[PDB]
From a paper:
Transthyretin (TTR)3 is a 55-kDa protein that aggregates into amyloid fibrils under pathological conditions. In its native tetrameric conformation, TTR transports retinol-binding protein and thyroxine (T4) in the blood and cerebrospinal fluid. Amyloid aggregation of TTR occurs by dissociation of tetrameric TTR into monomers; these partially unfold into amyloidogenic intermediates and self-associate into soluble oligomers and amyloid aggregates. Here we identify two segments of TTR that drive protein aggregation by self-association and formation of steric zipper spines of amyloid fibrils.
To better understand how 91AEVVFT96 self-associates to form fibrils, we determined the structure of the fibril-like crystals of 91AEVVFT96. We found that it forms a Class-7 steric zipper (Ref. 25 and Fig. 2D) in which the β-strands stack into antiparallel β-sheets with identical side chains on both faces. In addition, to further prove that β-strands F and H can participate in amyloid core formation of TTR fibrils, we determined the crystal structure of the steric zippers formed by the segments in isolation by x-ray crystallography. The crystal structure of 91AEVVFT96 revealed a Class-7 steric zipper with antiparallel β-strands and antiparallel sheets (Ref. 25 and Fig. 2D). The side chain organization explains why the residue replacements E92P and V94P hinder TTR aggregation because the proline substitution would decrease the shape complementarity between sheets in the steric zipper structure. In the isolated segment 91AEVVFT96, proline replacements in positions 92 and 94 completely prevented fibrillization.
Author numbering:
A (entry chain A), B (entry chain A), C (entry chain B), D (entry chain A), E (entry chain B), F (entry chain A), ...: 1 to 6
The structure:
Amino acid sequence: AEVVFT
Amino acid sequence: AEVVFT
Amino acid sequence: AEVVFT
Amino acid sequence: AEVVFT
Amino acid sequence: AEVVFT
Amino acid sequence: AEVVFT
Amino acid sequence: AEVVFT
Amino acid sequence: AEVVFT
């Protein structure tokens, strides 16, 4: 699982 | 920007 | 921004 | 910026 | 910013 | 598990 | 899994 | 799975 908030 | 890989 | 998962 | 790898 | 996981 | 807040 | 950003 | 954006 990968979460990237930018 | 939101990326969610599950 | 928000993510919730299960 | 938030990165969460699980 | 916040993450909670289990 | 990797959390990176920047 | 990998993320790169700028 | 992959995403690239600019």
